[PDB]
């Protein structure tokens, strides 16, 4: 690396070969590009050939099958026939505008007049990129369409909240590095122009941000120590609401604050554990709404496999005794000890399981299984135990799943291998999730951003919305062609273009986080520096979402941020310092 | 090919699918004599033969057109030894070869390993133990009431205490349990300081029960000290249980890597033990142990695969040797008969016999 | 009485038949072959018993058979001829293993299989005969032919594979009759060319899954049937299900090029109009009562649904034709709302809530037990490896067995777990004797558990390097020695067992594992029994990542006392479920106790530090499992309380103090 003319001269040609090493150390070398390119087309070709040969078709395949027929010249009569039958078109929400779909729409209805099309879109909030939604299709689509319309009336929240979400974005124009998405002037409603939240005498302003004391501390430090501050405020709010100190009121009518409607939002699943301990220490149980855990991962499926397979093997005395020792069955050590030595008590259960096997071989899983659920008097006995009703739901969920398994599969013995196959890999599909239990009362609800769409929340908490995560793999969209260009190498010019998109999507998700909180919203912040040292005079939060729009696109420090935080505070920003303490 | 020829035999019910598939998948596409020999060897090994001699296979000459089968290629294949030695699937014990031909009769590698282990165990392991001959004579005349002529019970006791490994053969109703009780009592009276763990075994449970009750009656008849009767062993176990045979696995809990610790052992009715059980029992025996064998030659031995008792007891007809004959003449005080010849000194020394019913 | 069911009674015979008729494109997955063997008729044809099925299962699992049948099959799909992990290779390996022993060496780059040597090996021949028959029909059924030649192959296949019985005679006659009928129609329509087998396959599938049973519509009990077209019978009570949106009426699109769909006439019959007429007919067919239900709330996320337009119109008409007796004249719209609220009732989400017992006794109990006289050493070892697991699996003879898993889908491209742990142990045991590694490498490449060629070569080259790096400091202090017998007595209890590698220096072991308190306790038990049976000498054990356990020599009285304590603990623990965690308690005692002062600093700061370390040990990171997460502990308790936490800390301290006392 130091043997280059661009290196040693700044740190003579010196040889004719001295310029050759500068050639071969400016562009790297590997086999990875060729291997990946040779893999990518052939895997797609082979899976499509196998699907065609066996005779199936995919939901991700029918769109491409339609697109080729529309692209080809054979289907112009089809293009005329569909527009004859359907002389109008409107699209819901337009964020998940796939390039396959937009090509169809622009080829069919952008021209061929006296047949109009409508578009309803919400140009931000863009949170289906991991599913496959692309914002560049909408960016291209905005150019050709001429008319543009905007609606203002909220009908939902406070004028203070509307003023906060209008004020927070007026520091810099083009807050998302894109000229193709506009400013956000929103006007509040008039019917509900008096929504006030009052607490302990005086009223309470809209947005309350929490500033962290110190110079260079991670958000992990908040999640360890100061994540309990939000739980402390929540506990204070609930204790004041049950004592008639806090109020929730419109006009002159009022209601006390329940222990249910206060919610807190996080970004990833990992910090759910980092926030749960901050709340269970102060003795408030918390319900979890991001429970994407499959039902198959619990103890009940593992016990259920043994219980069902012992029916299949009713003679092998070693594996028959697995089921009677389970926590579902509910026996004791003295209960098993008196049955091991005795012969007749052992002989009793043999015909009971033999009849169960006959019932399964005659009718199905449900007549077999519900007979066992009824015979041994177990559902009532689980109810007397501490939280047995919580465990009992999973048995019925698993039993329901076995019916849709056994209406497809016909081999009786193969249901066991189906179950053991589905045990291993925990897919996150729809039907394999849990159900909720309580509705008379509700705890504090924790849910992720993606599963927080279109619901009304009175009180929110956004603690960890200051940390970021930089991207590494270079994959960006061209500023003119808007295609998915892909460089398998590590060009920093492409890296910056792929990083600006990650910067914009975090801002969009930040805007998602603030279409909530009818009455009051609160959040935290932390000046985290990337380097391990503290005293350097700079920060790295302006590389994240909120820090860039609060630092006006400039690199600053704590000294340059302290008065910048406090400058714009007027009647809507109740800021407080970090509180390293416990109130109760 | 010959595949169809082998597959009418399964409809003839003359062979087994195991045997025909093994023979085909080992022989391949060589000369048909190799395939036929493989099939016949597998079938006869299944039927209860340890090995098949070449004389039967090359002199029955009725299972095929043997002339067109044997005499097929260059040279004369009726030299069957050269014909199968030039093949690939038969060797002389060097390469890990499926078929072994060493003692002019072919058989599988497992039988070869077990046979060589048994031959090594008898012909290179026996040890001439040494104790005081005067104390032997004193204990003999103290315990055995016979003092007038030579008695075969006394000769059996003398040779059993003489050698580490011994074989006793005789018919029923000859006081074998009484004699082995005399041996046990003499050994326990001989060894006072060192511990002597004694265990009994039998091939089957009814034989174990018979042995235990007969030994118990004999030891109640012949009195000793209370500590001596305490050191007398209590009960016997079946040999499968003694080796700890798992119902599913073939890995033993008392294999050679985990040797069972035992000082002496008495085994009855060896005629109901085939060769592999002898091999695995040899595998599970420590170095400083003494084992006594019991059985009968005249009764029907294992005419199926593996009868160690008859083929070892057949060497006893040669007689004793002069050195041990004179030594036991000194010990017993009577005229002990002597023999001639030389086959194996320790083995021929370690075969006694009975002559009184 | 349930009517209008589909004709499917002897399901697995038909399913096995259609799967076997899907032959000439299958890749012969071992799971599918065992699925074929699962059929009792097929098993009884080739005299294979359910007892032998388990032997076949574990033999196929251990052998390594994953892919298709033969070299023709692996070369037909244009793949390199690896020559391994096929059925011919597995059967050859198993037959060679019947022929000889495994330790004597490879013969044709195939390592013989140790298990099948006894009187169990007839299953090998039966399996080979079945595989030969399958290969013969695989070559046979590929070619196309006219229908008159396709006629007898179904009957030929049936009598070739299936053993007859009177029970399945109806199914066999059904298959034969349907096949003969299809080919009879095809020949009677005078076709001339050949046909691929897929047409006959899926046509026979649809023809067998077409027949119905409509016999018992008027059995006498309550009738369950579909909304039968062309039917109108008076009855006293009529009830309907499934009246939501998008389900009733049925929404069938036409064929897309129909002629009558563009010019309607009088005699048309659409499914939508048929359903909408049948609804009115069912309404007028009632005599006394009626009952209509639908689904309003989705169970997934408490969203909203809607009923159908028919019942919407019905309830609107009911509301607009009547009014309540209470509020006789208030307003029509409020009357509508109140009647519609009155006529609709809702039910609770779960069927156990009262709006529409005795607790579980604790599992731990005092148990009678009498101490035997003689105990083996390895019994104590297996007990003290994990005492709760031991109490479950030797006291009352249960085991929560993870049942026999399924065959892996392919040859292992990369090795983890025991599949490389025993390889590491074998390589270390070979390298400690300074012998050639190439012979053992050839042995494993013959056995068939290595990546094909270069990847396996590189894997061997790095594993040998790391094992040699350990083996250098292993062999730096080597001394020859032999084994000896162990016999000792303590508290009137005989202890016997064997112990290898006894040398005048002391003891020495090596294991390709990580350092642990369990391994420390193992070496502790062995060193205590060795020192108690005379024998002055220290002990040493090196592991991976430069670990070491080493103990000073002891006295006979102290050794006897420590063995007495351990024996009494074992006696108590097998009858009462003594609870010891050999990792979390070990970490807690290491943090809490200092060896220099021989005392515990018991301030609350170090207590909280030890509690933090203990909780981190009980629940580890997201990248390894925690010791507290285990099936025995889950069966014991479902949650942790500070009472049991204190009990665990106290008992672990009492029973593991000497380990950290004598550790150095």
Curated annotation (Swiss-Prot), chain A:
DNA-binding region: 219-220, 268-269, 469
Keyword Transmembrane: no
Domain UvrD-like helicase C-terminal residue range list: 188-454
Alphabetized GO MF terms: 3'-5' DNA helicase activity; ATP binding; ATP hydrolysis activity; ATP-dependent activity, acting on DNA; DNA binding; DNA endonuclease activity; DNA helicase activity; DNA translocase activity
BP terms from Gene Ontology: clearance of foreign intracellular DNA; DNA recombination; double-strand break repair via homologous recombination; recombinational repair; response to radiation
Phenotype upon loss of function: Decreased degradation of DNA with free ends that is unable to undergo homologous recombination, which can fortuitously lead to more efficient viral infection. Cells are deficient in DNA recombination repair and have increased sensitivity to UV light. The cultures have many inviable cells. Cells cannot be transformed with retron Ec48-containing plasmids.
Amino acids binding ATP: 155
Region ranges (ATPase, DNA-binding and helicase activity, interacts with RecC): 1-561
A GO cellular-component term linked to this record: exodeoxyribonuclease V complex
Annotated phenotype, changing residue 511 to H: Large decrease in recombination, loss of Chi hotspot activity, decreased RecB helicase rate, retains nuclease activity but not Chi-sequence specificity, does not load RecA
Subunit composition and interactions: Heterotrimer of RecB, RecC and RecD. All subunits contribute to DNA-binding. The C-terminus interacts with RecA. Interacts with YgbT (Cas1).
Function according to Swiss-Prot or TrEMBL: A helicase/nuclease that prepares dsDNA breaks (DSB) for recombinational DNA repair. Binds to DSBs and unwinds DNA via a rapid (>1 kb/second) and highly processive (>30 kb) ATP-dependent bidirectional helicase. Unwinds dsDNA until it encounters a Chi (crossover hotspot instigator, 5'-GCTGGTGG-3') sequence from the 3' direction. Cuts ssDNA a few nucleotides 3' to Chi site, by nicking one strand or switching the strand degraded (depending on the reaction conditions). The properties and activities of the enzyme are changed at Chi.
The protein, known as: RecBCD enzyme subunit RecB
Gene name as annotated: recB
Curated annotation (Swiss-Prot), chain B:
DNA-binding region extent: 246
Positions that bind ATP: 170-177
GO process terms (BP): DNA damage response; DNA recombination; double-strand break repair via homologous recombination; recombinational repair
Annotated control of activity: In isolated subunit ATPase and 5'-3' helicase activity are inhibited by non-hydrolyzable ATP analogs and EDTA. After reacting with DNA bearing a Chi site the holoenzyme is disassembled and loses exonuclease activity, DNA unwinding and Chi-directed DNA cleavage; RecB remains complexed with ssDNA, which may prevent holoenzyme reassembly. High levels of Mg(2+) (13 mM MgCl(2+)) or incubation with DNase allow holoenzyme reassembly, suggesting it is DNA bound to RecB that prevents reassembly. (Microbial infection) RecBCD is inhibited by the lambda virus gam protein (both GamL and GamS isoforms); in vitro a short preincubation prior to adding DNA results in maximal inhibition.
UniProt KW Membrane keyword: no
Residue stretches spanning the membrane: none
Keyword Nuclease: yes
Catalytic reactions of this protein: Couples ATP hydrolysis with the unwinding of duplex DNA at the replication fork by translocating in the 5'-3' direction. This creates two antiparallel DNA single strands (ssDNA). The leading ssDNA polymer is the template for DNA polymerase III holoenzyme which synthesizes a continuous strand; ATP + H2O = ADP + phosphate + H(+)
EC code(s) of this entry: 5.6.2.3
Domain remarks: The holoenzyme may undergo conformational shifts upon DNA binding: the nuclease domain of RecB may swing away from the DNA exit tunnel in RecC. When Chi DNA binds to the RecC tunnel the nuclease domain may then swing back to its original position (that seen in crystal structures), allowing it to nick the DNA 3' of the Chi site and then rotate to load RecA. At high Mg(2+) the nuclease domain may swing back more frequently, explaining differences seen in assays performed at high Mg(2+).
Name recorded for this polypeptide: RecBCD enzyme subunit RecD
Swiss-Prot record, chain C:
Signal peptide residues on this chain, from the entry's feature table: none
GO MF annotation: an example: ATP binding
Regulation: After reacting with DNA bearing a Chi site the holoenzyme is disassembled and loses exonuclease activity, DNA unwinding and Chi-directed DNA cleavage; RecB remains complexed with ssDNA, which may prevent holoenzyme reassembly. High levels of Mg(2+) (13 mM MgCl(2+)) or incubation with DNase allow holoenzyme reassembly, suggesting it is DNA bound to RecB that prevents reassembly. (Microbial infection) RecBCD is inhibited by the lambda virus gam protein (both GamL and GamS isoforms); in vitro a short preincubation prior to adding DNA results in maximal inhibition.
GO biological process terms held by the UniProt record: clearance of foreign intracellular DNA; DNA recombination; double-strand break repair via homologous recombination; recombinational repair; response to radiation
Top-level taxon of origin: Bacteria
Gene deletion effect: Decreased degradation of DNA with free ends that is unable to undergo homologous recombination, which can fortuitously lead to more efficient viral infection. Cells are deficient in DNA recombination repair and have increased sensitivity to UV light. The cultures have many inviable cells. Cells can be transformed with retron Ec48-containing plasmids.
Keywords per UniProt: ATP-binding, DNA damage, DNA repair, DNA-binding, Exonuclease, Helicase, Hydrolase, Nuclease, Nucleotide-binding
GO CC terms of this entry: exodeoxyribonuclease V complex
Family, similarity comment: Belongs to the RecC family.
Subunit structure comment from the entry: Heterotrimer of RecB, RecC and RecD. All subunits contribute to DNA-binding. Interacts with YgbT (Cas1). (Microbial infection) Lambda virus GamS protein interacts with the enzyme without displacing any of the subunits.
Protein's recorded name: RecBCD enzyme subunit RecC
Species per Swiss-Prot/TrEMBL record: Escherichia coli (strain K12)
Gene: recC
Residues of the full protein shown: 438 to 1121 of 1122
């Amino acid at each position: 690396s130091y043997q280059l003319p661009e290196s040693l001269e700044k740190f003579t040609p010196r040889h004719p070969l001295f310029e050759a090493i500068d050639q071969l150390l400016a562009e790297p070398l590997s086999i990875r590009d060729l291997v990946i390119t040779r893999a990518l087309a052939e895997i797609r070709e082979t899976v499509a050939r196998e699907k065609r040969r066996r005779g199936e078709l995919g939901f991700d395949d029918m769109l491409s099958r339609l697109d080729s027929a529309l692209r080809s010249e054979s289907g112009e009569v089809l293009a005329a026939a569909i527009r004859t039958r359907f002389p109008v078109a409107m699209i819901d929400e337009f964020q998940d505008t796939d390039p396959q779909q937009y090509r169809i729409f622009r080829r069919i209805w952008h021209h061929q007049p006296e047949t109009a099309l409508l578009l309803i879109g919400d140009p931000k909030q863009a949170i289906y990129a991991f599913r496959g939604a692309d914002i560049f299709t909408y960016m291209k689509a905005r150019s050709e369409v001429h008319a543009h319309y905007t609606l203002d009336t909220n009908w939902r929240s406070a004028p203070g909240m509307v003023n906060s979400v209008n004020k927070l974005f007026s520091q810099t124009d083009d807050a998302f590095m894109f000229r193709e998405i506009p400013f956000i002037p929103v006007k509040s409603a008039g019917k509900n122009q008096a929504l006030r939240f009052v607490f302990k005498g005086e009223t309470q302003p809209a947005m309350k941000m929490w500033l962290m004391e110190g110079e260079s501390c991670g958000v992990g430090d908040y999640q360890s120590t100061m994540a309990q501050v939000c739980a402390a405020q929540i506990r204070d709010w609930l204790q004041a609401g049950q004592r008639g100190e806090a109020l929730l009121m419109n006009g002159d009518d009022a209601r006390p604050v329940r222990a249910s409607d206060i919610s807190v939002l996080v970004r990833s699943r990992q910090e759910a554990a980092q926030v749960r301990d901050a709340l269970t220490l102060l003795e408030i149980p918390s319900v979890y709404l991001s429970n994407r855990d499959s039902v198959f991962e619990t103890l009940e499926a593992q016990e259920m496999l043994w219980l069902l397979q012992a029916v299949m093997t009713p003679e092998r005395e070693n594996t028959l005794r697995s089921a009677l020792a389970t926590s579902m069955m509910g026996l004791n050590a003295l209960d098993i000890e008196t049955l091991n030595n005795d012969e007749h008590a052992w002989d009793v259960v043999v015909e009971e399981f033999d009849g169960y096997r006959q019932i399964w071989r005659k009718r199905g899983v449900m007549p077999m299984l519900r007979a066992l659920m009824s015979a041994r008097n177990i559902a009532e006995n689980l109810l007397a135990t501490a939280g047995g009703e919580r465990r009992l739901t999973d048995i019925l969920h698993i039993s329901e799943l076995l019916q849709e398994a056994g209406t497809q599969l016909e081999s009786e013995h193969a249901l066991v291998r189906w179950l053991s196959q589905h045990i291993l890999e925990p897919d996150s599909n729809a039907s394999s999730q849990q159900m909720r239990l309580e509705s008379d009362k509700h705890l504090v609800q924790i849910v992720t951003i993606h599963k927080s769409k279109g619901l009304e929340y009175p009180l929110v908490w956004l603690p960890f919305i200051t940390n970021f995560r930089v991207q590494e793999q270079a994959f960006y969209h061209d500023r003119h062609s808007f295609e998915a260009v892909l460089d398998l190498n590590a060009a920093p010019e492409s890296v910056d273009l792929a990083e600006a998109e990650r910067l914009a999507e975090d801002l969009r998700l930040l805007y998602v986080a603030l279409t909530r909180s009818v009455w009051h919203c609160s959040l935290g912040v932390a000046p985290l520096v990337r380097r391990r040292g503290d005293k350097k005079g700079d920060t790295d939060v302006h590389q994240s979402a909120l820090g860039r729009l609060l630092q006006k696109g400039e690199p600053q420090d704590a000294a340059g941020l302290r008065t910048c935080i406090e400058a714009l505070c007027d009647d809507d920003i109740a800021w407080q310092t970090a509180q390293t303490g416990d109130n109760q | 090919k010959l595949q169809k020829q082998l597959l009418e035999a399964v409809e003839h019910k003359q062979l087994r699918p195991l045997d025909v598939q093994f023979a085909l998948t080992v022989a391949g596409d060589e000369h048909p004599a190799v395939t036929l020999a493989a099939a016949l060897l597998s079938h006869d090994a299944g039927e209860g033969h340890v090995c098949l001699p070449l004389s039967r296979l090359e002199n029955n000459e009725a299972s095929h057109p043997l002339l067109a089968t044997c005499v097929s290629e260059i040279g004369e294949l009726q030299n069957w030894e050269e014909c199968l030695l030039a093949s690939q699937a038969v060797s002389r014990g060097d390469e890990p070869t499926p078929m072994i031909l060493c003692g002019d009769r072919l058989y599988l590698n497992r039988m070869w390993c077990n046979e060589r282990t048994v031959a090594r165990f008898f012909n290179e392991v026996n040890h001439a133990i040494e104790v005081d001959e005067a104390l032997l004579a004193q204990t003999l005349d103290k315990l055995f009431p016979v003092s007038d002529e030579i008695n075969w019970q006394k000769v059996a006791a003398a040779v059993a205490l003489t050698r580490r490994i011994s074989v006793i053969s005789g018919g029923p109703g000859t006081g074998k349990t009484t004699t082995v009780a005399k041996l046990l009592a003499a050994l326990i009276q001989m060894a006072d300081g060192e511990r002597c763990r004694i265990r009994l075994a039998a091939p089957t449970g009814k034989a174990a029960a018979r042995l235990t009750e007969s030994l118990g009656k004999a030891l109640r008849q012949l009195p000793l000290t209370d500590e001596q009767k305490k050191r007398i062993p209590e009960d016997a176990s079946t040999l499968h249980r003694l080796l700890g045979a798992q119902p599913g696995s073939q890995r033993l809990r008392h294999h050679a890597g985990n040797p069972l610790h035992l000082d002496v052992l008495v085994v009855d009715e060896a005629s109901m033990i085939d060769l592999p059980m002898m091999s695995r029992l040899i595998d599970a025996l420590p170095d400083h142990a003494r084992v006594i064998f019991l059985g009968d030659r005249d009764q029907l031995a294992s005419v199926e695969a593996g009868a160690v008792l008859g083929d070892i007891c057949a060497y006893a007809n040669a007689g004793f040797t002069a050195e041990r004959a004179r030594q036991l003449s000194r010990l017993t005080g009577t005229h002990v008969p002597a023999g001639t010849g030389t086959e194996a000194a320790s083995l021929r020394d370690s075969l006694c016999l009975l002559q009184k019913s | 009485a349930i009517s209008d069911r589909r004709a499917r009674q002897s399901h697995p015979v038909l399913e096995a038949f259609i799967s076997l008729l899907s032959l000439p494109d299958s890749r012969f997955v071992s799971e599918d072959v065992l699925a074929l063997l699962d059929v009792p008729v097929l098993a009884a044809r080739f005299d294979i018993t359910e007892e032998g099925l388990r032997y076949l299962r574990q033999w196929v699992n251990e052998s390594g058979i994953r892919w298709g049948i033969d070299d023709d099959n692996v070369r037909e799909l244009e793949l390199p001829a690896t020559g391994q992990h096929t059925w011919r290779f597995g059967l050859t390996r198993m037959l060679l293993g019947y022929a000889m022993e495994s330790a004597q060496g490879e013969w044709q780059s195939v390592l013989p299989y140790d298990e099948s040597s006894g009187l169990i090996a007839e299953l090998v021949g039966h399996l080979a005969s079945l595989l030969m028959q399958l290969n013969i029909w695989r070559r046979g059924l590929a070619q196309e032919r006219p229908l008159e030649e396709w006629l007898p192959v179904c009957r030929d296949m049936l009598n070739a594979f299936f053993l007859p019985d009177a029970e399945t005679e109806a199914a066999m006659t059904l298959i034969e009759q349907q096949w003969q009928a299809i080919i009879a129609e095809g020949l009677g329509a005078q076709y001339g060319d050949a046909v691929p087998l897929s047409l006959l396959r899926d046509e026979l599938a649809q023809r067998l899954d077409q027949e119905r049973i409509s016999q018992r519509f008027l059995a006498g009990p309550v009738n369950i049937c579909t909304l039968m077209p062309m039917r109108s019978i008076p009855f006293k009570v009529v009830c309907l299900l499934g009246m939501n949106d998008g389900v009733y009426p049925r929404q069938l699109a036409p064929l897309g090029f129909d002629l009558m769909s563009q010019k309607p006439k009088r005699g048309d019959r659409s499914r939508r109009d048929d359903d909408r007429y049948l609804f009115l007919e069912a309404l007028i067919s009632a005599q006394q009562k009626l009952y209509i239900s639908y689904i309003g709330r989705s169970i997934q996320d408490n969203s909203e649904r809607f009923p159908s337009v028919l019942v919407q119109e019905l309830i609107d008409y009911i509301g607009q034709s009547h009014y309540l007796p209470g509020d006789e004249a208030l307003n029509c719209d409020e009357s509508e709302a109140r009647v519609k609220a009155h006529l609709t009732c809702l039910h609770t989400r779960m069927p156990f809530d009262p709006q529409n017992g005795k607790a579980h006794s604790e599992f731990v109990q005092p148990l009678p037990f009498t101490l035997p006289e003689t105990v083996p050493l390895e019994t104590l070892q297996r007990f003290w490896a994990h005492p709760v697991r031991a109490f479950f699996q030797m006291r009352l003879q249960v085991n929560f067995r993870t049942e026999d898993s399924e065959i892996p889908d392919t040859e292992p491209f990369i090795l983890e777990g025991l599949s490389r742990y025993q390889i590491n142990q074998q390589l270390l045991n070979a390298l400690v004797e300074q012998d050639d590694a190439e012979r053992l490498f050839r042995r494993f490449r013959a056995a068939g558990d290595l990546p094909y060629g270069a990847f396996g070569e590189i894997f061997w080259e790095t594993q040998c390097q790391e094992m040699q790096q350990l083996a250098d400091r292993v062999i730096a202090c080597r001394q020859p020695g032999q084994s000896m017998e162990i016999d000792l007595a303590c508290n009137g209890v005989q202890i016997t067992g064997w112990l290898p590698q006894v040398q005048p220096d002391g003891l020495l072991r090596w294991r390709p594992s990580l350092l642990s308190v369990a391994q420390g306790m193992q070496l502790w038990l062995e060193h205590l029994v060795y020192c108690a049976s005379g024998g002055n000498g220290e002990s040493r054990l090196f592991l991976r990542k430069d670990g070491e356990w080493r103990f000073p020599p002891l006295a006979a009285e102290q050794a006897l006392h420590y063995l007495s304590q351990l024996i009494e603990g074992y006696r108590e623990g097998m009858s009462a479920p003594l609870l010891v965690l050999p990792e979390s308690g070990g970490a807690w005692l290491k943090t809490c106790y200092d060896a220099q002062n021989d005392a515990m600093l018991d301030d609350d700061s170090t207590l909280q530090k030890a509690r933090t370390k203990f909780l981190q040990a009980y629940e580890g990171n997201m990248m390894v499992r925690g010791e507290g997460d285990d099936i025995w502990y889950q069966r014991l308790w479902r949650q942790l309380t500070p009472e049991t936490m204190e009990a665990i800390v106290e008992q672990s301290q009492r029973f593991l103090l000497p380990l950290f006392r004598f550790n150095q």
